[PDB]
Design a protein around this ligand. Sequence first.
Ligand SMILES: Nc1ncnc2c1ncn2[C@@H]1O[C@H](COP(=O)(O)OP(=O)(O)OP(=O)(O)O)[C@@H](O)[C@H]1O
Lengths: 115, 116, 220, 145, 147, 276, 116, 59
Amino acid sequence: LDPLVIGQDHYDTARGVQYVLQRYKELKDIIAILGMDELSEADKLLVARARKIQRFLSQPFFVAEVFTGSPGKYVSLKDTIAGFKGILNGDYDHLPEQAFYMVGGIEEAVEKAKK
Amino acid sequence: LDPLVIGQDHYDTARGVQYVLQRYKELKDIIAILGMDELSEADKLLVARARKIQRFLSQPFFVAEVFTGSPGKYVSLKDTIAGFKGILNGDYDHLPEQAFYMVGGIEEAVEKAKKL
Amino acid sequence: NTIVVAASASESAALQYLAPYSGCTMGEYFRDRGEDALIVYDDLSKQAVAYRQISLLLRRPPGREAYPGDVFYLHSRLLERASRVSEEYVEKFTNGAVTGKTGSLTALPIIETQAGDVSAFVPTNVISITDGQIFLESAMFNSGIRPAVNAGISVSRVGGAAQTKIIKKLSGGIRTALAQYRELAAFAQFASDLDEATRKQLEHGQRVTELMKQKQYAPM
Amino acid sequence: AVNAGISVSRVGGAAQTKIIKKLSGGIRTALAQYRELAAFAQFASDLDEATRKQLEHGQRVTELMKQKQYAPMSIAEMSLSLYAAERGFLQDVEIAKVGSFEQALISYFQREHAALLAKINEKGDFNDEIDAGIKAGIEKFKATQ
Amino acid sequence: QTGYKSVDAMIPVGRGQRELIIGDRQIGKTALAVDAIINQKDSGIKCVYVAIGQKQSTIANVVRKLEENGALANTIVVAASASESAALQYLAPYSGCTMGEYFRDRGEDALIVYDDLSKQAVAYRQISLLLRRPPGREAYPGDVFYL
Amino acid sequence: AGAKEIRSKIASIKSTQKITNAMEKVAVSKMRKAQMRMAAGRPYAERIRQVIGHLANANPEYRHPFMVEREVKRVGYIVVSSDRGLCGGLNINLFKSLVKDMSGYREQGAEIDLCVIGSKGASFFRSFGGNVVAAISHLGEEPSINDLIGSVKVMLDAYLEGRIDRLFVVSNKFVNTMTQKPTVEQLIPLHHWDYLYEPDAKSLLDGLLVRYVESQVYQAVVENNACEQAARMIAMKNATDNAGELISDLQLIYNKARQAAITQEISEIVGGAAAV
Amino acid sequence: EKFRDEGRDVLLFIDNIYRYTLAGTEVSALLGRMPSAVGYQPTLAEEMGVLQERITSTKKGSITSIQAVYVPADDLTDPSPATTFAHLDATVVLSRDIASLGIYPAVDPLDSTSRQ
Amino acid sequence: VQPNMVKVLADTVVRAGDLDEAAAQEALKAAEKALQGKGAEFDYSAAAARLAEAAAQLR
Ligand SMILES: Nc1ncnc2c1ncn2[C@@H]1O[C@H](COP(=O)(O)OP(=O)(O)OP(=O)(O)O)[C@@H](O)[C@H]1O
C-alpha cells in the first residue's frame, strides 16, 4: 500500500476508507449515550457512508457456501476501487445500508436495493 | 501553608484557587459531552474564571528563553496574591482567557488583552 | 499526659518492626491496673514494610506483594491487645489492690493507601481486623471540607453504645440530613425548578455539610 | 436459553435428516430479526407493515423454541412444530397460546395421523406426499379443533 | 438427536463431532447434556457421563434422573467428586474416553459428556504448581492447551 | 489495557450520569409548568368558538372567506418545532407526518407554502430547500401570543388574496406524559335568541375569526413545548440507563485487569526469588 | 458430625468462609508452595471441597450450613467467591432499606436466590 | 353579555395596524431562504428513515 506500487487512485480510495472508518470509531461513546441526532450534519453523513463502507467490506465466500447457501463471489480489483470510490463520492447516498451487505459488486447492491 | 506562617489573606487566596479548580475538574467532562450552554449561570462564571486561573498559573522563565522565544519574568509574592485575588473577585471577568497565558504580573495580562 | 515512642526512618528495620509492640506494652501498663489508655500507631503500613524487609532478607517464602504469610498475624497480634477488661481481670491481676474498676486500651491505627485503593493487601487486613474505619478522601479535602471524613462509607460497629445521651439524641437527624444531601447534591445548581420539600431537604443538607467543617487544634 | 447469534456447528446440515434440514432454514433469520426488534414491542403500533410482521414472526419463533426439561421430542414432532412456524400457520395465533397450540397439534397428529409420524420417524424423509399430508392435517386442525 | 428443538434445528450434532456447551453457572449445561444422554436410549448410541469436580449429591441426583427416565442401562457413569485427589480429577476424562473408545474401535457408536473440563484444568494446574512448574496466563501450565 | 485509564473512564461516565439524572427532573418541572400554561388558554377559545358558531347561524346574510371552501390546487402548512436538541423523535416523527401529508398534494401538481416556528424546522427547510413565506425562532420556555401575530397575519393574508385555499398546522399533542402524537389539523375552514350588535356584526365576525386562529396557533405552540419537555425527560432517562450499561462493561474489564496485574507481579517475584 | 450420627438434623454456622480461604493462603505461603492466580493457594478448590463435601444429607441425619460470605473488592469473579458459590445452594441477602422501614427480618425478597 | 353571564375577552397588546403590520413585515423579512428548491425532492425520506431507525438503538 504505497503509491509507487499500486497507483494514486487505489491508494487514495484506501486512505479515504480508513479516514471515514477512523472518524466513525471516534464517535462510538457519544453515539451510544446521546444518539445520532445530536451530531452535526457532515458527521451524520460520514456515519451513514461509514456504515455503508462497513457493510460493503463483507463478501460471500465459495468455501462458506455450506454455512449459508448463498453463492460465492469473485470480485476484481477494478470493481472494488470503483465501488468504494462511488460510496466515498456520494453516488449511492440514496441506497439503504442493508443492500450493501453480502454482495460481490456495487451493481449487485444496486439490484439488491430494488427488492 | 498555614495561616500562622503566611497570613490569613495568602491562605484564603490559595484555598479559593484550589476550590475553583477542583470544581472545574468535576465540570470538564460535562462540558465535553453536552456543551457549555447546558449548565447554570454560576457554573459558566466559575468555568470562565477557572480557565483564566489555569492560564495565569503559567510563567515565562529566564532559563527557558531558548524554548519559548519570549523573555522571562520575575513576579513578586504580593503581585501574585493581588492578581489571583483580582481574578477570583471577578475584577477581570471581561478579559479573554488567552490574555493570561505566558505574561507574568496581572498588569501584563491587561496589556496583552489589547493586542488580541 | 503522653508517652512518645520513636523509631525513625534511618534506624534499623528491627526497631521499626518492634516499636508498635513496645508502645502497646507501655499502654497495657494502664489497662491492667484499672485505668484507661489511648494509643496511636501513625503508620502500621511502614511497620509492614520493615517486617517485609526482615522476612525477605531471611529468605522466607513470599506471597502477595512479596509480603510473608504471617503479616495478618503481625497486625492481629498487635490490635487484639487493645481491649476493655472486666473488674474480675483487674482484681485478679493486682491481687485485690484495685477493686470494682474496668481497664482499657483504645487503639487508633493509621493506614496510608495508594490513590484510594483500599483493596490492597495490608489495608484489607487492617480493615478486616478493626471494629471500624474513618475514611479520608482527597477530593473532599481539595473542596474545602478540611476534616475530610466521608460519612457515607465510614462505620463504627459499637455505635451509640459509645456515646453520651445528648450526642446520641442529636446525631440521628444530622445523619439523615447528610444522607439526603448525598442523594440530592447534584440538584443544587438546578434547585430553582425543584419541589418545595426537596428544596428544604437540600438546604438543610447544605447547612449540615457546612457545619461539619472544623479547624485544626481546636477540639470542642 | 440458546443464543442463536453466536452458536454454530461446523458440520451443519451434512449430519441432519432431510425434513429437519428443509424446515429449519427460516428459524435463524426469524430469531435474527427478533434480536434488535425485541426492545421495540413497547411502541410497535406506530411502525410499518414489514417491520411489524417481522417482529410478530420473531415473537412466534421465539415462543416456539421454549421447551421443558425431561421432555424429548421425536423427528416428527419437531417437524410438525417447524412446519407450523415456517409455513405461516402461527399468524392468527397469539403469543401466550403458541406452545399450548403446539402441544394440542402434536396430540391430534398422534390420534389421527399416526402412520404419517411413523413414516417420518424412519429416517427423516421428505417428499410431496409427506408435505401434502402434514398441510392437510394442520388445515383440518386449524378448522375443526 | 438431542431432542431439543433449537439444538436439532439450528446447531446440529453428528456422530464424531465435538460440540462445546459453554456458559455461566446455573443456566442449564448439565441439563442439556443429560437430556442428550437420555435421548440415546433407543437409538443405538451408547453413553458415557464423566463428572469432574462436582458434588456427590449432584452426581447421585443425576444417576437417579437417569434411572427414572430409563437410560441408566445404556450409560456408564465415571465420577471424581470435589473432595477427591486432583490426580483422579485430572485422569477421569481419559478413563471415560477409553471406555467410549472400546465402542468406537469395534464399529459401534458412543457419546461422552465431560461435565466440567474447566475443573479438570484447575486440578491439572494444582498438580503442576505443586511440581514447581513455571506458569503462564492465569497461572495455568504451558501445556494446558495440550491437556 | 491498564486499570488506571479504565478507572478514569468509569469516573467520567459516572460524572455524566449524575447530571443526566438531574436534567430528567428539570424536564419534569418544565413539563408541569408548560401544562399550567396549557390549561389557561382554553376558556378564551371555547367562548370565542361558541360565539362564532352562534353568529354564523344567527346571521346567514354574510359569509366570511374563512368559513367557505375553494377547490383550487394550493395549500398552506404551519409547522411547530423546537429550537434545542435532546428530544427523542418529536421533530422527526412530526417531519415524517409532514412529508406524508405533503406528498398527496405534491403528486397532484399543487403548490405548497410553509410557515416555520422553531430553529430545527428552519434547519430542515434550510438544508433541503423548502419555500418559506414566514419564519420565527428564539421563542423561550414561555411563548407570548404577540410574537405569533405577524406570521399568522402573513398566513391569513396569503389566504385572503386567494393564494392559499386550505390551511393546516403540524404540531404534537399531549396524549399523556409518555406519548406525543404528531398530527395535522385544519384551521381556516371551521338557544333561539339573538345578540344585539353595537357595531356592524360583519366586522365583529372579521375580528373574531382572526383572534380564533391566533388562539389555536398559540395553544398548538404551548402544547408542543410541553411535548418537547416530555421527550427531553424520556431522552435523559435513556441516557442515564445507557451510561450505566457502559459503566458495568468497563467494571468487568477493570476487574479482569486487576486480577492479571496481581498474577503477573507474583510470577515476577517467584521467578526472581528462584534465581537467588 | 457426631450430632448428625445420633440421628438428628444439625445446623452448622460458619462466621466467614473467606477467612478459612485466607488462612489456607497463609498456611500455603508459610510452607513455601508456589502461588496460583490472584495470590491464592494452588489447593484452593480442593481445600474448599474437603470442607464442603462433608456437609450433606446422609441416611442417618443431615447437617445444613449457614455461612457468611465476604466478597473481595466487590468482585464476584474473584477466585475465592467463585470457588465458594459453586457449593452454595441458597443465598440470603440482608438489606438496610428494608430494616429502615421497620420490617424485621431484613431479607431482600428480590435479591435472595435459591436452587430449590 | 348573557343575562346570567358576562364575558370580557381581552387583549395582551393594542391591536392597531401600525403595530401589527410591522410584525408582519418582520415575519416576511426573517424567512431564511438559502437555496431555491423545487420542493419535490426525495432527500427528506432518505435522511428521515435513517434517522428514524437510529433513534430506537438508543431506547
Ligand atoms: N429447559 C428447562 N426448563 C426449565 N428449567 C430448566 C431447564 N433446563 C434447566 N432448568 C433448570 O435450571 C437449573 C440449572 O440447571 P443446571 O443444574 O443444569 O445448570 P448448570 O449450568 O449445569 O449448573 P451447575 O453450575 O450446577 O453445573 C436447574 O434447577 C434446572 O431444573
